[PDB]
Amino acid sequence: CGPKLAACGIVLSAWGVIMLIMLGIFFNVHSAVLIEDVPFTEKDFENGPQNIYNLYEQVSYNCFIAAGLYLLLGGFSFCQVRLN
Amino acid sequence: HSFALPVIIFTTFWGLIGIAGPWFVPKGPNRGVIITMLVATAVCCYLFWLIAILAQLNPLFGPQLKNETIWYVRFLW
Amino acid sequence: TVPSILNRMQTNQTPPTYNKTNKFTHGFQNIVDAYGIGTYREINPAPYT
Amino acid sequence: ELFRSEEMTLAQLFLQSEAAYCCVSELEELGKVQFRDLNPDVNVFQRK
């Protein structure tokens, strides 16, 4: 590892969790500013908001899973910073 | 409700920081620094916020939105 | 036993300019001083800074 | 008060030669004094 990598992993872990959880919030409230981030198609306007709401759930889960990877990076880095 | 209530709240909040703050500072070598920091913080915050909130009054033209966002404004809210 | 006592001077040149500082104010003084140093008793730009 | 540069005094002293060393050291521990150079001719062999 080395302490350089562990320190980078701490900074990345903090930043990743902060941004991805905040995105999780905006996706769960169906915020309009996030529309460009949602990976929909021209057919997803059919009937009403049902498809875009399902995609809002998927991108919320994407960010939640990615935040989980940053939590794992964090727990690793908080050990390695003491071990190197 | 009226915009005057926010204006009086913000003016009171920063006015106390910029007046009552200084009036509670102790005697000591740092006194002039502490007073200057309180006053300058209140003046800059007040002026900067006041300009931004005043500029949002009576918009001369609204936002213009992409086609897809206009379609989503039918249902998301 | 001699206390080596001083006197104040009268034929005075302009003294070197000073300001006391701490951990917070030192940095803010340095970014003024890096451009220029006030004349004696001059207003300090640093507290406003 | 730090809104303006602090008041300074030029002073002269008559310094007793045995005490002089100790005096300078207490002044350097105090850290509040700047010495005026009285020797424009100072050099490796001219330094007293």
Side-chain angles (χ1 to χ4, degrees):
Chain A
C1 184
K4 295 178 175 182
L5 181 59
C8 296
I10 289 167
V11 171
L12 287 167
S13 177
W15 184 255
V17 173
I18 289 164
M19 294 299 291
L20 294 167
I21 297 302
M22 181 160 63
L23 287 168
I25 294 167
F26 287 118
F27 290 137
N28 290 348
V29 307
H30 310 287
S31 174
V33 172
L34 282 294
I35 285 165
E36 289 197 319
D37 304 276
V38 187
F40 70 85
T41 69
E42 297 93 325
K43 294 183 178 181
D44 297 308
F45 291 103
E46 182 167 41
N47 303 328
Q50 294 83 355
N51 288 34
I52 192 73
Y53 289 172
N54 293 347
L55 292 169
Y56 268 116
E57 292 193 338
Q58 288 289 354
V59 299
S60 182
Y61 291 127
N62 299 344
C63 300
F64 186 83
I65 291 161
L69 297 172
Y70 282 113
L71 290 166
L72 291 168
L73 177 66
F76 172 82
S77 305
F78 294 128
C79 300
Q80 294 299 336
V81 77
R82 293 178 171 84
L83 296 166
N84 299 255
Chain B
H1 183 278
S2 176
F3 187 74
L5 170 64
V7 171
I8 292 163
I9 291 161
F10 303 140
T11 301
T12 303
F13 176 83
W14 291 115
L16 290 167
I17 293 163
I19 299 169
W23 298 353
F24 303 148
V25 180
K27 295 188 181 183
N30 54 2
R31 176 179 180 83
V33 174
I34 298 158
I35 290 169
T36 300
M37 290 175 71
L38 292 167
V39 174
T41 299
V43 171
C44 288
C45 292
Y46 182 62
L47 181 64
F48 177 78
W49 174 269
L50 179 64
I51 286 163
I53 195 177
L54 287 177
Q56 296 265 302
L57 299 183
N58 298 0
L60 264 64
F61 61 92
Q64 178 175 351
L65 305 179
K66 292 185 180 180
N67 178 70
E68 289 63 43
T69 297
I70 299 171
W71 291 40
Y72 289 126
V73 170
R74 298 165 63 196
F75 300 108
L76 270 58
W77 299 89
Chain C
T1 58
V2 173
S4 303
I5 292 160
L6 66 110
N7 69 271
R8 300 186 180 80
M9 296 298 284
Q10 296 73 35
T11 55
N12 302 339
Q13 300 302 331
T14 298
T17 291
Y18 176 60
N19 312 284
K20 184 175 173 69
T21 55
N22 66 33
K23 297 182 185 177
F24 295 82
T25 60
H26 178 67
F28 294 122
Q29 189 70 55
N30 297 329
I31 61 176
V32 174
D33 291 9
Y35 297 127
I37 305 300
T39 61
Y40 177 53
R41 307 190 298 106
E42 191 155 24
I43 187 166
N44 183 4
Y48 313 101
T49 302
Chain D
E1 294 184 49
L2 293 172
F3 79 81
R4 74 179 195 204
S5 296
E6 297 193 63
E7 288 72 19
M8 294 298 290
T9 297
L10 178 68
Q12 177 180 103
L13 66 153
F14 304 92
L15 182 62
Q16 191 279 325
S17 63
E18 188 150 288
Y21 176 99
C22 299
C23 295
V24 168
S25 75
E26 294 306 329
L27 291 169
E28 289 251 36
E29 176 55 30
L30 177 65
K32 294 182 177 172
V33 74
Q34 183 162 11
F35 290 82
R36 189 182 181 220
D37 179 13
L38 306 184
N39 302 314
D41 300 326
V42 73
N43 203 352
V44 64
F45 308 136
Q46 300 294 345
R47 66 191 182 165
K48 298 304 187 182

